[PDB]
Amino acid sequence: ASGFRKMAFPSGKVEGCMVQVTCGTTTLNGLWLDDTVYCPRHVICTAEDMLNPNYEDLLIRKSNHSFLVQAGNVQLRVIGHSMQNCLLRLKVDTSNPKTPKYKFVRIQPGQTFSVLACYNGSPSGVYQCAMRPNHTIKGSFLNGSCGSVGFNIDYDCVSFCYMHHMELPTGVHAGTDLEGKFYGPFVDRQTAQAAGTDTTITLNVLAWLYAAVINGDRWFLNRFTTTLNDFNLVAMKYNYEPLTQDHVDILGPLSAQTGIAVLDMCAALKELLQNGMNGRTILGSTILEDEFTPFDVVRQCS
Amino acid sequence: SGFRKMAFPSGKVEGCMVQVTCGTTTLNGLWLDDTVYCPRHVICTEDMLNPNYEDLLIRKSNHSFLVQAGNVQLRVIGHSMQNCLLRLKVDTSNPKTPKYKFVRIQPGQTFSVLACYNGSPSGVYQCAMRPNHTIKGSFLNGSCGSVGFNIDYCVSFCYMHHMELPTGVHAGTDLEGKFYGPFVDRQTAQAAGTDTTITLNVLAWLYAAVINGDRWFLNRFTTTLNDFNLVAMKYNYEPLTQDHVDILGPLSAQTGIAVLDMCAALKELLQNGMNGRTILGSTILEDEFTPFDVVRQCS
């Protein structure tokens, strides 16, 4: 066993759910599960509308015939519509036989998921990312990628956690869950909203340092330990998220796999933050990586 | 602003992965039409010190191979060896067979790997064939037979995984069963040679940066190819050839920045570092995006 990669879930179960939704001159992606298509509600909006849209008002002026849904080049007739928070739910007259076992999950900041980038209902690529502490994603989404989704897979069950809606002024991305509720304080209208202060996901950096040790990188270890409190006093000065006992407990399995006490790994991290990596690498990286969860590491190394 | 290395969507390949078990050895196979392709060392144990594969395969019958496609057993009705692969004929043509071709990839080129265990896909990631004919993968026990691929409109299979080398990098074959590099499927002293940075791809990534609006590193100067190679080779970069300069033609056209002018920018970056700044959000020069990747993503 060797190597460590930013790995995404295989995307096939999600590929079979992607469709195109068109309303007026706006086209974006939808998610087709059973007899329902989910997509961002701003598909119904004019540029003037975006604006200061009242979505109940804009929606009541649609019918079913206002929505063109296509799987490939085959139209799916819309037989009903409704809004749920910032999503539209379109009922179509055919069921998708490729619908996987699935659920809708609202993820927490710091958690990771795979994104299937799509344009015009066609999968383009797949990548793994993390939900930042500030509820943005550092994604890769070009014009027309709205409605692309984020997901995890436990065996044969797909947990959908993200649907893409917008790009913020800093070039980061924002998004709803599959109940249409935004992650973070963002709204689907044209206003001067901005990504909040972000932090490094400490739990994930510690996970990745465990990954390095599993992979044979130990140069950053030392003979010291720390208390949680003393660690946080240091880490917080470097814009790291405060580390809690729950996070310490989460790292349990990896500490037992490697035989390095969590607080001894925290001591290593403290040293790296204070002294840097002059100019060495960990798992080939020159920076401390924070987009692998403890669970991610356990999965990839076990 | 917002660049990610992406893998191809893996669904077309997932539909082709099966489990192949021969005795106590299980690995993955690729089921296309009525043939399953897998590493020939599925028939091996100790054998791996000096395997006479012909002889070992003499003592197997079709019945020796258990192939499992999800919950279904595919009856093996024929078997043969082709270079370092077994080809098992099965009684069922894969209903999920995509349009496909087998290609042999060149050093520096990229592909997506679908990591599989027990015939079940577990993850997908993008990687490059290193100049030393290895890949820097992530593979656990049981991953043998996992495949690498690109998709164009058509799935081009380019890699099948066979082994881990002493430094933790990975070696495998094309889909005709010929190894990339000098490696052999037996237990030797074999080791990866020294590797270099993939200059062509670093240049590609700098063009990507420019296309995306990150252009602080550009200057008003140029270099000859030879003078660039004198400098770059000191930093363990692959020598740049006139063929590589041509491959960057479309990106150079698109941006209006001559290749040798971009080489002048890279030379300054190598000789002076980034002085704090980042390129495409990175603090290092990325070498696993090809010119074709850049074009594909930025369209």
Ligand SMILES: C[C@@H](NC(=O)[C@H](Cc1ccccc1)NC(=O)OCc1ccccc1)C(=O)CCO
């Ligand atoms: C349907 C399309 N939606 C947009 O363009 C959204 C609509 C919107 C949502 C919420 C608040 C304001 C505006 N606009 C939006 O994200 O505006 C900024 C932007 C920056 C960079 C690239 C593209 C766009 C897409 O497919 C966007 C994908 O980039």
Ligand SMILES: C[C@@H](NC(=O)[C@H](Cc1ccccc1)NC(=O)OCc1ccccc1)C(=O)CCO
């Ligand atoms: C069936 C399995 N194959 C192996 O273990 C192959 C068999 C082999 C192929 C070619 C030459 C010699 C030996 N062995 C192999 O890769 O040995 C090197 C190694 C393995 C594990 C940890 C460290 C080093 C796999 O699933 C390979 C994936 O790990």
